[PDB]
């Protein structure tokens, strides 16, 4: 793992217009089921370019121009505030608050559905992958589309070694000893 998967920080260009970036690499991230996309943007304030790391939606490719901002088009890979999208649009890496660089719908094959808009108080009702309903500020950004790599859990692991390889790069506890297989000093289920 090199860099965290975040949006750009919310700046003037994304607040008032759009900025174009180019997808240079689509890379594998260890411990994550979803591929990442490296996108290069211009810095509006200096000559040097800025490289960002997004969670890649399905259909994104190297050499593609994506657009991030209020006036960006409704196209897969583009990053828009939720106030700029119609109802029924599915998005990924949705910010809980504007500027948190994305929190919801991040794992492979998952997305967040924009259910409704309340423009009077500037709120947006969304549906999460767990089925929960949520209200977020309408200026929260999301990337149009579905996170790539879906159907990963359909394949059986079939082998203790494949489970071991999955969890060794993830730090999760493996193998797992049952509590009832333990002595009473170790677990409340012990004995």
């Amino acid at each position: 793992r090199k860099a965290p998967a975040k949006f750009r920080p919310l700046d003037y260009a994304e607040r008032h217009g759009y900025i174009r970036g180019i997808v240079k690499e689509i890379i594998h991230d260890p411990g994550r089921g979803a591929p990442l996309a490296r996108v290069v943007f211009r810095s509006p304030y200096k000559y040097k370019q800025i490289t960002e790391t997004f969670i890649a939606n399905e259909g994104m490719y190297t050499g593609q121009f994506i657009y991030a901002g209020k006036n960006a088009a409704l196209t897969v890979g583009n990053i828009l505030p939720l106030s700029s999208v119609p109802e029924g649009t599915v998005v990924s890496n949705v910010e809980e608050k504007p500027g948190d660089r994305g929190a919801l719908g991040r794992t492979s094959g998952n997305y967040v559905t924009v259910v409704g808009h309340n423009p009077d108080e500037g709120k947006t009702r969304i549906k999460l992958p767990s089925g929960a309903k949520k209200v977020v500020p309408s200026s929260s950004r999301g990337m149009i589309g579905i996170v790539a790599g879906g159907g990963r859990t359909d394949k059986p692991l079939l082998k203790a070694s494949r489970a071991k390889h999955k969890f060794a790069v993830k730090r999760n506890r493996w193998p797992k000893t049952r509590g009832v297989a333990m002595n009473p000093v170790d677990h409340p289920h012990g004995g």
Partner: protein
């Protein structure tokens, strides 16, 4: 000259893990090892690099896709209703 009658690519697992689990893993293995026609250059050279990543050997384009297939039916349906929503929004 068919060498196995049903196991196919699952013959490498022998008699282990159960018939149903071998049959379930077979479909993912076949799709994830197949070659696919590139949508950019038209050649039959797109193969899986890692999970969710599909690369074309000829034109060197790398695409984010499904875990074991280049495209997901949910993603294709998403593209269709996205194009409908874009037409409604623009018009």
């Amino acid at each position: 000259s068919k060498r196995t009658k049903k196991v196919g690519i699952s013959g490498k697992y022998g008699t282990r893990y159960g018939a149903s689990l071998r049959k379930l893993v077979k479909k993912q293995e076949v799709t994830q090892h197949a070659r696919y026609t590139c949508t950019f250059c038209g050649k039959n050279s797109v193969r899986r690099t890692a999970v969710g990543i599909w690369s074309c050997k000829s034109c060197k384009k790398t695409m984010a896709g499904g875990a074991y297939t280049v495209s997901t039916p949910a993603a294709a349906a998403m593209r269709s209703t996205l194009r409908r929503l874009r037409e409604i929004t623009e018009a």
